[PDB]
Design a protein around this ligand. Structure first.
Ligand SMILES: OC[C@H]1O[C@H](O[C@@H]2[C@H](O)[C@@H](O)O[C@H](CO)[C@H]2O)[C@@H](O)[C@@H](O)[C@@H]1O
Ligand SMILES: OC[C@H]1O[C@H](O[C@@H]2[C@H](O)[C@@H](O)O[C@H](CO)[C@H]2O)[C@@H](O)[C@@H](O)[C@@H]1O
Ligand SMILES: OC[C@H]1O[C@H](O[C@@H]2[C@H](O)[C@@H](O)O[C@H](CO)[C@H]2O)[C@@H](O)[C@@H](O)[C@@H]1O
Ligand SMILES: [Ca+2]
Ligand SMILES: [Ca+2]
Ligand SMILES: [Ca+2]
Ligand SMILES: [Ca+2]
Ligand SMILES: [Ca+2]
Ligand SMILES: [Ca+2]
Ligand SMILES: [Ca+2]
Ligand SMILES: [Ca+2]
Ligand SMILES: [Ca+2]
Ligand SMILES: [Cl-]
Ligand SMILES: [Cl-]
Ligand SMILES: [Cl-]
Lengths: 149, 149, 149
C-alpha cells in the first residue's frame, strides 16, 4: 500500500503545483499583465538602486527595463513618479548596459541628458512624460520590478 | 523511517493546500471581492472575444456576465471602457445565449440594439453607461473575468 | 525505488513551499507593502466590527491599527472612507485597548472625541481626513486588515 500512497501523493502535488501556477497567473492578470507581455509592478517605495536590484531579485524578477516605446509607457503608468530602470554605464562612461546583459538599444533621454552630473550619474530613471534622466545610483527612486512575459 | 516520512509529507501537503486556500482568499479580498458575492477582475487589456473567453477559461473563471442590475454595475465599475460580456448569438442569429449556456434572462440593451449591423455582430459589450450593444466578436474590447461567489 | 521517490517528494514539497512564499511576497509588494513595514488591504466592503475582526482573522491578519502618523496616513489612503480600527474600549469603558492587547498610546482623535455617544460607542473609525471618532461596533464601516512587517 505504501507505493500506492506515494503515487497518490505525487498526484496531489502535481495538482497543487498547477493550482499555485493559476494563483500566480490570476495575480499577474489582476495587476495589469497584458497577454504575452512582461509584467511590471511597484510598491511605490523609493530606495537606492542596489536595494531595488536586491528587492526585485528576491521576488525572482528584475529591475524594470523598457525595450521599446510600448514598454516605456507601461512602466511610466505603473511608477507615478521617478523610477530606476535596469540600466547603468558603470563599466564605461556613456555606454549604458542592461543589468541583465547587453548594450542599450531603445532609449528615451530627456533634453540635455545624460549629463553625468556632479560627482557622476551612472544609473537611469524614467521620469515625467516617460523621459529618461541619468542619476546617482545612491539616489533614492521608486522600485519597479519586471517579470517575464 | 519510511512510513513516518510518508505520513509527515501527507500532512505537509494538506498544510500547503490550506495555506494556498488562504492565499487565494487574501488575493480575492485585495481584488475587491465582497462577502458571498461573485467578483470581477480585469488587466485592462482590449482583445477579440475569442481571446477573452480563452483567457478567462484558463484562469478558471468566465467572461463577465451581469445576472441583474447590481452585477451589471459592478462590472461597469471594474471595466471603465467598452468590455465584452459572456453573451453571444453565434449559434443562432438573433438568439443570444450565455457562454455558460442557457437563454438570456436579464438584459440592458441600448436603444435599437442588438442589430447585427454591417457584416454582422454576435458578441456583446458593456459601454461607459451600462447599456449593452452587440459588436463583432472580432473587435477588441476590455477583458473582464468573473469568479464564483 | 521507494526512498528515491520519497526524497523527490520532499524536494517537490520544499520547492512548492518556496514558491508559495514568493507568491505571498510578490502579492504584498503589489499591495504596496514597504520594506520592513506592515501593509494594509481592503475589499472596500462595509460591515459591523465583529465581521471585520472575523474576516481579517481568517486571512491571518487583524483589523488595521495605526501605531503612528505614517501608518495612519497609509490606512487612510487605503480606506478612502470611514473604516474600523483595531482599537476598542469594550472591555473597560473609557480605556481604549488594541484588539491584540495593550493600552492605546498613539492616537489621532477629532476634537471632542472620543465621546461614547448615545447608548455608547466602543469601537473606533478613521474618517475621510484621517482623524478618529468612536462609534457603535454595530455600525457598518469599511473593512481594512493589516498584515505584519
Ligand atoms: O542631480 C539630479 C538631477 O538634477 C537635475 O534634474 C532635476 C531632477 O530631475 C528633478 O529634481 O526634477 C527637476 C525638475 O524637473 C530637474 O531639474 C539635472 O541636473 C539632472 O541632470 C540631474 O540628474
Ligand atoms: O459596429 C459597432 C457598433 O457601432 C455603432 O455604435 C458605436 C459603437 O458602440 C462605438 O464606436 O461607440 C459609438 C459612439 O461612441 C457608437 O455609435 C452601432 O452601429 C452599433 O450598433 C454597433 O454595434
Ligand atoms: O460628530 C459628532 C458625533 O456624530 C455622530 O453622532 C450624532 C451626534 O451625537 C448628533 O448629531 O446627534 C445624533 C443623533 O441625533 C448622533 O447620531 C456620531 O458619528 C458620533 O460618533 C460623533 O461623535
Ligand atoms: Ca561613470
Ligand atoms: Ca554616467
Ligand atoms: Ca542627469
Ligand atoms: Ca450571426
Ligand atoms: Ca448577431
Ligand atoms: Ca450593434
Ligand atoms: Ca462601553
Ligand atoms: Ca465607549
Ligand atoms: Ca463619537
Ligand atoms: Cl552613480
Ligand atoms: Cl461577429
Ligand atoms: Cl459599541
Amino acid at each position: 500500500a505504501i507505493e500506492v500512497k506515494l503515487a497518490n501523493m505525487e498526484a496531489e502535488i502535481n495538482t497543487l503545483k498547477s493550482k499555485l501556477e493559476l494563483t500566480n497567473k490570476l495575480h499577474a492578470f489582476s495587476m495589469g499583465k497584458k497577454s504575452g507581455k512582461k509584467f511590471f509592478v511597484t510598491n511605490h517605495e523609493r530606495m537606492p538602486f542596489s536595494k531595488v536590484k536586491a528587492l526585485c531579485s528576491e521576488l525572482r524578477g528584475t529591475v524594470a527595463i523598457p525595450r521599446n516605446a510600448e514598454e516605456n509607457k507601461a512602466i511610466q503608468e505603473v511608477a507615478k513618479t521617478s523610477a530606476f530602470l535596469g540600466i547603468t554605464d558603470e563599466v564605461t562612461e556613456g555606454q549604458f548596459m542592461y543589468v541583465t546583459g547587453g548594450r542599450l538599444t531603445y532609449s528615451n533621454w530627456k533634453k540635455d541628458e545624460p549629463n553625468d552630473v556632479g560627482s557622476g550619474e551612472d544609473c537611469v530613471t524614467i521620469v515625467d512624460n516617460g523621459l529618461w534622466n541619468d542619476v546617482s545610483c545612491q539616489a533614492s527612486h521608486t522600485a519597479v520590478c519586471e517579470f517575464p512575459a
